[PDB]
Amino acid sequence: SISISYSTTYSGWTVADYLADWSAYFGDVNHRPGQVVDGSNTGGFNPGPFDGSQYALKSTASDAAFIAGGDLHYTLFSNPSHTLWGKLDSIALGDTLTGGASSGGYALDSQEVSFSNLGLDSPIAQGRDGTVHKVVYGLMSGDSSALQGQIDALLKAVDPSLSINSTFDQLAAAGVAHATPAA
Ligand code: MH0
């Protein structure tokens, strides 16, 4: 089942609350045609350059950041172009990236919430319509709807009473979430 870790700072928050709020701070890095010309809004893979167990990206509006974990692959200019696909196990959200390929891996200085054991696997054949692509490109572009939908489906798979409109606390009571110390 999905496993969620959250700082007790967000006790009382719903998952949807938090994601909407995080997305508001992160904004949109404008990773769009004609608007990616350097490393300021690409993010990066570990080990990379185009494949990794992690992909990480910091906001260009704030120091909000996320890390996607799993077995991940970006097609860049090969077909289907600009598609992230593969296995997505985790999404970790917070503030300020640290580390990298040459540091033992990426991490967040403040990791606020993470979602793991997502069990998502999108084949390259699905192109940008794959769930993995939609989830991560959504986050990059200021739209966490895809992530929210997937989390909601995973929670309801555990029990139909669970939701992204559940508080983190309720999800902990249900055995899916685990509180970590204040942020
Ligand atoms: C190797 C650097 C690099 C990384 C890392 C990178 C990471 C990501 N990308 Fe993405 N991306 C990179 C280099 C580009 C460029 C250079 C362009 C601009 C293409 C153009 O101007 O026609 C771009 N990406 C453009 C895109 C576009 C726009 C394509 C279009 O509308 O035609 C999407 C959807 C995209 N990416 C997805 C992603 C996703 C998802 C990730 C996360 C893995």
Q: Which two tokens stand for residue 166?
A: 């559940």
- 123 prior amide bond cis, ω within 30: no
Which of the listed residues 74, 83, 135 should we mutate to test ligand 1's pocket, taking the one with most ligand atoms within 8 A of CB?
74
Strand-strand pairing, 51-58 and 64-74: antiparallel
Distances (CA, A) of 56 to 39, 66, 100, 153, 173: 12, 6, 9, 24, 30
Ligand 1 atom nearest residue 49's Cα:
1
Q: Residue 101, exposed/middle/buried by CB under 10 A (0-12, 13-18, 19+)? A: middle
What residues does each domain of the chain span?
Answer: 1-183
CB 31 less than 6 A from any atom of ligand 1? yes
| Amino acid code (one letter) for 55 | Y
Contact between 166 and 156 under an 8 Å Cβ cutoff? The reply is: no
Binding-site positions for heme = 31, 74
Q: Which residues pair with 66 in a beta bridge?
A: 57, 93
Method for this entry: X-ray
| Amino acid code (one letter) for 46 | N
Class of the 1-183 domain? alpha beta
Binding-site positions = 31, 34, 74, 82, 128, 137
Ligand 1 atom nearest residue 45's Cα:
5
CB 138 less than 6 A from any atom of ligand 1? no
3-state helix/strand/coil string of the chain = CCEEEEEHHHCCCEHHHHHHHHHHHHCCCCCCCCCCCCCCCCCEEEECCCEEEEEEEECCCCCEEEEEEEEEEECCCCCCCCCEEEEEEEEEEEEEEEEEHHHCEEEEEEEEEEEECCCEEECHHHHHHCHHHHHHHHHHCCCCHHHHHHHHHHHHHHCCCCCCCCEHHHHHHCCCEEEECCC
Contact between 168 and 10 under an 8 Å Cβ cutoff? The reply is: yes
Sign of the alpha-carbon torsion through 167, 29, 31, 67:
negative
In the reported structure, the alpha carbon of residue 106 is separated from the centroid of ligand 1 by a whole-number distance in angstroms of 20
Planar angle of CA 87, 80, 84, nearest 5 degrees: 30
Contact between 171 and 161 under an 8 Å Cβ cutoff? The reply is: no
- Residue 6 to residue 135: CA distance in whole angstroms: 19
Nominal resolution (angstroms)? 1.5
Strand-strand pairing, 105-116 and 120-122: unpaired
Ligand 1 atom nearest residue 44's Cα:
5
Residue minimizing CA distance to atom 42 of ligand 1:
84
- Residue 169 to residue 44: CA distance in whole angstroms: 33
Q: Which two tokens stand for residue 164?
A: 């992204």
